[PDB]
Amino acid sequence: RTILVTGGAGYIGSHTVLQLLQQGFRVVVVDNLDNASEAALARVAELAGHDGANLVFHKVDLRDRHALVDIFSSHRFEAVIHFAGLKAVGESVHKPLLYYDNNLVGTITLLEVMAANGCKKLVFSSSATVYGWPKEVPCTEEFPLCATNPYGRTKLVIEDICRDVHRSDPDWKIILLRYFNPVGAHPSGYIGEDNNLMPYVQQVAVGRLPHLTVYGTDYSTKDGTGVRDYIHVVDLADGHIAALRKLYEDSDKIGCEVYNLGTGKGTSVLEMVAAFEKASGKKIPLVFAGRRPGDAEIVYAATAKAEKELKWKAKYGIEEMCRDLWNWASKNPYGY
Amino acid sequence: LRTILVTGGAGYIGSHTVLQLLQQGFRVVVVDNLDNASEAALARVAELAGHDGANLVFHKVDLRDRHALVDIFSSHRFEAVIHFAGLKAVGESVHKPLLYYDNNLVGTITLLEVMAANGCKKLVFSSSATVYGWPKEVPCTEEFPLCATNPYGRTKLVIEDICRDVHRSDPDWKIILLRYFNPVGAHPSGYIGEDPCGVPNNLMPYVQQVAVGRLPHLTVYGTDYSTKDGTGVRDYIHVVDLADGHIAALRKLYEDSDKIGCEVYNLGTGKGTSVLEMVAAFEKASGKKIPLVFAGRRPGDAEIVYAATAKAEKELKWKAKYGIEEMCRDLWNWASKNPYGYAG
Ligand SMILES: NC(=O)c1ccc[n+]([C@@H]2O[C@H](COP(=O)([O-])OP(=O)(O)OC[C@H]3O[C@@H](n4cnc5c(N)ncnc54)[C@H](O)[C@@H]3O)[C@@H](O)[C@H]2O)c1
Numbered sequence: 001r002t003i004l005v006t007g008g009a010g011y012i013g014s015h016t017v018l019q020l021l022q023q024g025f026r027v028v029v030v031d032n033l034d035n036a037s038e039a040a041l042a043r044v045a046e047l048a049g050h051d052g053a054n055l056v057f058h059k060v061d062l063r064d065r066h067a068l069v070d071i072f073s074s075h076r077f078e079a080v081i082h083f084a085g086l087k088a089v090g091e092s093v094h095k096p097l098l099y100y101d102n103n104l105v106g107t108i109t110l111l112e113v114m115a116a117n118g119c120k121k122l123v124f125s126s127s128a129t130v131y132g133w134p135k136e137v138p139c140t141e142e143f144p145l146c147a148t149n150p151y152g153r154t155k156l157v158i159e160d161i162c163r164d165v166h167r168s169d170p171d172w173k174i175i176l177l178r179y180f181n182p183v184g185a186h187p188s189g190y191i192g193e194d195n196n197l198m199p200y201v202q203q204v205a206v207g208r209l210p211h212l213t214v215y216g217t218d219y220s221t222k223d224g225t226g227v228r229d230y231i232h233v234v235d236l237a238d239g240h241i242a243a244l245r246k247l248y249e250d251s252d253k254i255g256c257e258v259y260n261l262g263t264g265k266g267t268s269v270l271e272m273v274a275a276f277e278k279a280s281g282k283k284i285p286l287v288f289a290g291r292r293p294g295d296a297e298i299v300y301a302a303t304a305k306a307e308k309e310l311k312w313k314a315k316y317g318i319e320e321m322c323r324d325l326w327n328w329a330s331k332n333p334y335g336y
Numbered sequence: 337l338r339t340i341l342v343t344g345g346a347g348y349i350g351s352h353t354v355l356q357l358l359q360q361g362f363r364v365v366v367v368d369n370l371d372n373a374s375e376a377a378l379a380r381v382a383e384l385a386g387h388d389g390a391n392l393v394f395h396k397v398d399l400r401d402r403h404a405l406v407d408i409f410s411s412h413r414f415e416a417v418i419h420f421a422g423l424k425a426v427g428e429s430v431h432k433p434l435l436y437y438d439n440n441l442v443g444t445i446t447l448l449e450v451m452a453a454n455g456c457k458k459l460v461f462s463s464s465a466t467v468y469g470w471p472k473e474v475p476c477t478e479e480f481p482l483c484a485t486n487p488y489g490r491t492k493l494v495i496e497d498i499c500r501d502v503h504r505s506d507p508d509w510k511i512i513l514l515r516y517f518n519p520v521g522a523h524p525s526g527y528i529g530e531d532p533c534g535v536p537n538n539l540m541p542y543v544q545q546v547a548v549g550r551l552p553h554l555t556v557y558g559t560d561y562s563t564k565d566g567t568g569v570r571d572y573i574h575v576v577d578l579a580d581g582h583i584a585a586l587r588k589l590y591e592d593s594d595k596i597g598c599e600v601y602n603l604g605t606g607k608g609t610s611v612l613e614m615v616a617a618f619e620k621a622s623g624k625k626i627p628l629v630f631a632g633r634r635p636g637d638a639e640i641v642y643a644a645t646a647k648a649e650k651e652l653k654w655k656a657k658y659g660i661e662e663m664c665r666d667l668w669n670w671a672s673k674n675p676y677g678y679a680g
């Protein structure tokens with residue numbers, strides 16, 4: 001069984017490719033290497049051992065229709081997992097056309113080529129950013145949707161495109177996965193991430209930054225700092241194995257489904273700092289600051305739908321995430 | 337010399353706007369792929385424009401053809417772009433959503449990128465009152481909540497949001513989004529007008545085909561709404577008034593650029609008219625009788641929608657000059673002189 005993984009050289013994608021190879025899939029990755037190194041997939045192939053030969057890599061942009069058509073014509077794909085996209089919020093505010101072009105034109109082209117080739121099974125990387133600034137927690141998949149920056153708008157637009165495609169053509173089977181806050185690295189520390197709290201904390205721990213600025217101390221949370229659902233990247237990867245299994249075993253009873261991928265636990269900024277201090281043995285000097293414009297106060301997942309319908313629950317906790325980030329970053333201070 | 341690039345200018349609203357522009361002395365470059373129009377509308381525009389027809393140049397190009405679009409922008413100095421190009425059939429958008437997302441979003445994104453790279457950051461965009469969805473009150477002001485109820489409507493709202501994000505990223509952009517209400521009618525000469533393919537999806541093109549004998553009756557979709565007669569109520573605006581609202585938008589960009597960023601204005605009349613009232617007005621204009629069939633509501637239809645005109649009146653200095661009687665007169669003149677459209 002062969003899976004096309006767009007964006008598979010990136011953070012979540014590379015961890016997912018490793019698990020797919022262990023599960024016995026043939027994997028074809030398409031990635032333009034805009035935001036990733038080819039070394040990530042070389043290392044994934046090493047970690048895959050006996051299954052490393054089942055990984056094929058093509059340096060292709062999804063907007064290159066001809067190149068994409070040739071990839072689909074050379075393989076019979078069971079499904080596509082679509083991680084490719086740009087994701088930096090600040091860059092999206094400064095360069096919105098870059099984001100709308102890359103994310104929307106790349107996705108639309110992929111969907112068209114998929115339909116023309118008869119591959120109508122998709123798993124899409126969405127994000128909890130589509131819940132906006134939620135009025136209540138935990139956030140269920142039925143919550144009101146609204147994006148708060150151009151990057152988030154691209155994710156919500158793509159979800160809506162997928163729902164419209166499914167309504168137009170019931171042969172499509174689509175799973176949208178709303179990831180919460182990814183942290184960590186494979187526990188080998190040989191692959192990992194190469195703009196967010198925990199990467200900043202780790203840089204403070206090694207002295208590359210003098211302090212962590214804490215954005216907001218007057219929130220209505222236990223310690224006054226912002227609260228998020230931090231989820232180990234290996235758990236996120238595993239949720240994609242569950243999504244392929246759902247498409248493989250339960251396609252007759254799904255259409256365009258959406259599931260949160262989170263832990264269901266909210267952890268504050270200071271709690272994550274404390275967990276990282278314990279993992280690293282380092283102190284993280286703090287500067288307390290005002291709220292950061294655009295920040296939600298508290299966001300975490302309602303896990304019930306994923307637990308019952310996707311048959312998936314996260315397995316790793318925040319201390320483990322912090323240890324695995326520390327291990328990767330200590331062994332690889334400059335990434336790959 | 338002032339030159340305007342008009343995308344989608346071979347279509348219904350675009351052709352009427354091209355004509356008004358030519359009559360004001362603008363040079364007009366039209367980009368249109370002719371997917372939903374023929375050259376005939378533009379050739380009649382050029383005929384009505386007299387010697388000013390020499391000031392209309394037509395480029396048969398798709399907005400997604402980046403190389404061809406770059407060639408146009410690099411060889412012209414444009415004061416502004418008016419962007420009418422797009423697909424607009426609701427039912428087709430539900431059945432073929434990728435066609436709509438591709439044409440409308442990829443075309444618009446390509447256009448904005450080519451504009452920005454070639455130093456033309458002045459845009460007037462064809463939006464729609466569809467973004468108000470099912471309004472909780474009327475009249476609808478520009479600050480009402482925005483939604484989309486079908487894939488076509490989603491493309492319009494997404495493009496409005498792209499434009500707002502582009503402006504926020506780069507204050508040299510000046511963008512006017514125009515939310516059209518329900519366009520009806522034709523230039524009073526009767527030489528140009530709406531020429532739909534197939535069975536018309538909208539009320540007044542359907543009515544006129546009944547009046548000229550090509551279809552046997554109008555089906556009325558829904559008679560149980562909470563309105564005066566039970567049928568849907570809309571703000572019908574003469575297409576020539578819509579065209580004049582674009583002249584007003586260009587004037588605002590030309591004279592008031594500093595005070596604006598990415599602004600939005602309704603283009604409507606502020607009056608709601610029901611389906612039955614439009615049929616009666618068309619019977620009076622045409623002298624024909626329109627037989628009716630009664631049916632249930634059409635999925636997705638709003639009950640009552642009409643414009644709050646105060647912002648356009650104050651800030652664009654624009655108000656509609658035509659009423660329902662004139663819209664119906666002008667539609668009938670186009671229909672009876674061209675019962676089979678441009679093809680004859
Ligand atoms: N009249 C309405 O029902 C109505 C009301 C509100 C808003 N609008 C919007 O107003 C605009 C004009 O309306 P209209 O009645 O003149 O529609 P129309 O279909 O007559 O005009 C659209 C024109 O755009 C052209 N076009 C489409 N895709 C193109 C592309 N990629 N490149 C170049 N040209 C392309 C078509 O060939 C057509 O001539 C449209 O964008 C429409 O969505 C429609």
Ligand SMILES: O=c1ccn([C@@H]2O[C@H](COP(=O)(O)OP(=O)(O)O[C@H]3O[C@H](CO)[C@@H](O)[C@H](O)[C@H]3O)[C@@H](O)[C@H]2O)c(=O)[nH]1
Nearest residue numbers: 089127129180181182196197200213214215226227269295
């Ligand atoms: O230097 C920092 C960075 C973050 N925070 C706080 O830490 C928490 C997490 O922040 P961050 O890592 O920026 O994540 P989010 O605010 O949840 O959102 C970012 O991270 C998400 C997960 O990767 C993405 O989906 C979003 O698009 C992206 O804006 C927030 O409460 C922040 O206020 C700080 O106090 N100091």
Ligand SMILES: O=c1ccn([C@@H]2O[C@H](COP(=O)(O)OP(=O)(O)O[C@H]3O[C@H](CO)[C@@H](O)[C@H](O)[C@H]3O)[C@@H](O)[C@H]2O)c(=O)[nH]1
Nearest residue numbers: 464465466516517518537538539542555556557568611637
């Ligand atoms: O054969 C018909 C067609 C329409 N109607 C009724 O007539 C009214 C107007 O319908 P229509 O002409 O189809 O316009 P709307 O659906 O209001 O849509 C128009 O008004 C919106 C506001 O801009 C635009 O988005 C649309 O593209 C534009 O075509 C509605 O109450 C319809 O139920 C009928 O009874 N029979």
